[PDB]
Amino acid sequence: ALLQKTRIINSMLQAAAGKPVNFKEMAETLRDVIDSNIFVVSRRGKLLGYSINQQIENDRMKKMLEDRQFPEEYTKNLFNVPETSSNLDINSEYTAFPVENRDLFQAGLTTIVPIIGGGERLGTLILSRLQDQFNDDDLILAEYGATVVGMEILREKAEEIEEEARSKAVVQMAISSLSYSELEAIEHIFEELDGNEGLLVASKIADRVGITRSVIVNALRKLESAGVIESRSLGMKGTYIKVLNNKFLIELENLKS
Amino acid sequence: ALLQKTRIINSMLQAAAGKPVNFKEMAETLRDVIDSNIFVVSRRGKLLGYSINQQIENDRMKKMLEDRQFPEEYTKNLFNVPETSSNLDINSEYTAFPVENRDLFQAGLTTIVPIIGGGERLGTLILSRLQDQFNDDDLILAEYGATVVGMEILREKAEEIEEEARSKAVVQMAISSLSYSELEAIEHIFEELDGNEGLLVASKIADRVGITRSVIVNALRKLESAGVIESRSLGMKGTYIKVLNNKFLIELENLKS
């Protein structure tokens, strides 16, 4: 069980991947292969992956998952030591944790595990064993279970730079290449409208400022072309409106200046 | 030495580094740990740099240093190596290599390692020795050290896709806020010029064509703070125009009509 306990956790390790990137799925082979409780915590205490394995009743886990957040001094003291710890509980070989908070280790043979998945430090991987101690073939996995999570913290937060950052730019790259009419079109079309969606006249809103009628069509022959929306435009009843892009609404409100 | 000589490889781990990747040095910190030849061959079958110390007899590992590329059948053959099988010279075990292509292992005990990463094949990292074999603890350094060769492949090509994407795009954005007139200026500016570095008069250049100077004032005061050109705006006498952007006026050539 040195080459077989690392070959069922692999049937779960994903690199970015298509199916939902979720920590509430990441410790599947860390409960019956490590056979130990798994906590996946990020830098300053913010919870994205939880779940105790065995019913151990402490007074900082009976009120902790109740908040979904590490409190006051659980943001400045869970991010200091360069490496792991051997056999943590009410006893500690040295000053493992501050004398103000010796209570995170009262219920379990706990093991705070460092995530090093890119040449850095990604929060914590807090374990808490019932009776059995951490020895040989269930310690390397408690460490390996931190980087089976560490190909996904920069894959549930690095989808926050590829999709979230881009969507701003395109929703500007299309707006940039608009002449004044079409730029006054889409600004009056989506302000005098049903917040989210819309459906009204084809060109009765057109020349009530001074603009023309058919320049309204090509204004939409921009968004549809750059790549923002879908609209089954009827030549018999105005037109159809429903957004596709997720970040266009905000960059439409804050434009009154 | 399975965690002390690994801080000569995990500490070599320079994520993107910060300097335009050098590829022989990346093949030198695998030479001061396992102690062997290094051949960082990528996916298409090309070569980038080599750290060889001892003189070993070889046949097509020396037409791979001259050409830097394999002819005909190797790109097909070494495309079919899944993981890390240990020690294959003139004698393997199954149908791993053709007999006509078997001359890649003749002399010495060479152990080929694939560079798997991100969920795809990136190439073969070739290591060859003379009279020492890759033992029970000499090759997981080429397994954990094949997870990160692709790092500076998804950081070097990743600073030649975002680096290129941004270019051709910024090269276009500026083009946009240039009204047809303001464009006409650019079409005349670079066409009558010597080399990349060119400069001539303020009053003349304009109505020589017919255009005003006023729409070169603001026209070249767009690409200025946009991010395309630097030019010391001497209102006393014209100005000198050098580009901040490379493949930019190459977008001016093909877009004639």
Residue numbers in the entry:
A (entry chain M), B (entry chain N): 2 to 258
Sentences from the study reporting this entry:
We have solved the structure of unliganded CodY in three different crystal forms containing 14 (form A), 10 (form B), and 2 (form C) molecules in the asymmetric unit from data sets extending to 4.6, 3.0, and 3.7 Å spacing, respectively. Examination of the molecular packing in the crystals of unliganded CodY reveals that the basic building block of all three crystals is a tetramer. The tetramer in the form C crystals and one of the tetramers in both the form A and the form B crystals are generated by crystallographic 2-fold symmetry. Superposition of the eight tetramers from the three crystal forms suggests that they are essentially identical within the limits of the data. In the crystals, four CodY protomers are assembled into an unusual tetramer in which four wHTH domains are sandwiched between two GAF domain dimers. For the unliganded form in particular, the tetramer is compact with extensive subunit interfaces. From within this tetramer structure, there is no possibility that the wHTH domains of CodY could bind to DNA in a conventional manner, because the GAF domains of partner subunits in the tetramer occupy a substantial volume that would be taken up by the DNA duplex.
